[PDB]
Amino acid sequence: GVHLSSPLASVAVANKLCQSFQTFNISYSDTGLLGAHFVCDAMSIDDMVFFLQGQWMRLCTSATESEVTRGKNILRNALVSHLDGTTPVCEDIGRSLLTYGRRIPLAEWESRIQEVDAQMLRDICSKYFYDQCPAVAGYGPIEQLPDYNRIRSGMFWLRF
Amino acid sequence: REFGNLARIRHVISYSLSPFEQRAFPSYFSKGIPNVLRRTRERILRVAPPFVVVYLIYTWGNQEFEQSKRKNPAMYE
Numbered sequence: 001g002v003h004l005s006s007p008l009a010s011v012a013v014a015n016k017l018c019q020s021f022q023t024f025n026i027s028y029s030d031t032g033l034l035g036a037h038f039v040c041d042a043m044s045i046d047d048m049v050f051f052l053q054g055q056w057m058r059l060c061t062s063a064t065e066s067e068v069t070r071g072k073n074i075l076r077n078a079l080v081s082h083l084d085g086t087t088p089v090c091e092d093i094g095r096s097l098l099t100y101g102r103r104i105p106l107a108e109w110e111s112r113i114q115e116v117d118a119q120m121l122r123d124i125c126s127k128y129f130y131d132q133c134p135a136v137a138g139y140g141p142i143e144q145l146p147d148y149n150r151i152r153s154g155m156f157w158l159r160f
Numbered sequence: 161r162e163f164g165n166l167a168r169i170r171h172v173i174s175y176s177l178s179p180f181e182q183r184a185f186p187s188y189f190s191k192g193i194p195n196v197l198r199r200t201r202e203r204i205l206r207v208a209p210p211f212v213v214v215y216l217i218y219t220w221g222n223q224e225f226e227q228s229k230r231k232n233p234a235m236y237e
């Protein structure tokens with residue numbers, strides 16, 4: 001409901017904007033796609049783009065320690081919940097040896113997570129999000145989906 | 161009225177790049193000059209004959225006005 005911690009989903013349930021959204025971080029050998037994907041009605045695409053870009057730049061500029069430690073706890077739970085089970089453990093082992101060349105233990109993952117704090121989060125988010133040219137893929141009734149110029153103009157702020 | 165319910169478009173795919181990744185003036189002269197020449201050739205025969213007959217009427221009117229202000233040599237006496 002409206003009591004969700006994440007501001008984007010709270011705004012979505014308050015305004016009945018979207019049917020769904022997700023954040024993804026797909027990685028390949030020294031490259032990747034970091035972003036979001038949402039399913040929404042044709043009359044709310046501009047609002048979801050505006051609110052998602054606002055949340056991205058809020059993390060870029062004024063991300064706070066409370067949501068940083070909330071995201072840290074969510075990431076710890078996500079990593080352990082994924083690595084619970086023989087099939088995902090074997091998948092992690094094979095993928096880790098193919099990509100990293102070694103199997104990173106959960107202790108090392110937790111050490112990196114504890115290394116992440118608010119200033120580091122806003123610095124890395126400003127490096128990878130702020131004033132960057134995005135890739136947009138729209139499918140369906142996407143007439144209200146803004147053009148690339150408006151999407152990029154949302155991908156910066158005039159007040160930092 | 162607004163975006164979303166303007167038209168009915170199906171099965172149309174649009175491709176665009178970043179302004180920060182593509183050139184602002186991609187072959188500005190080597191393709192701009194033939195395009196301007198083609199547009200001029202396409203729309204030159206609809207404007208130039210009226211403007212030339214304006215020029216002809218202007219010169220004719222000025223000339224015959226000067227000739228009307230000229231003295232007729234019939235009145236020697």
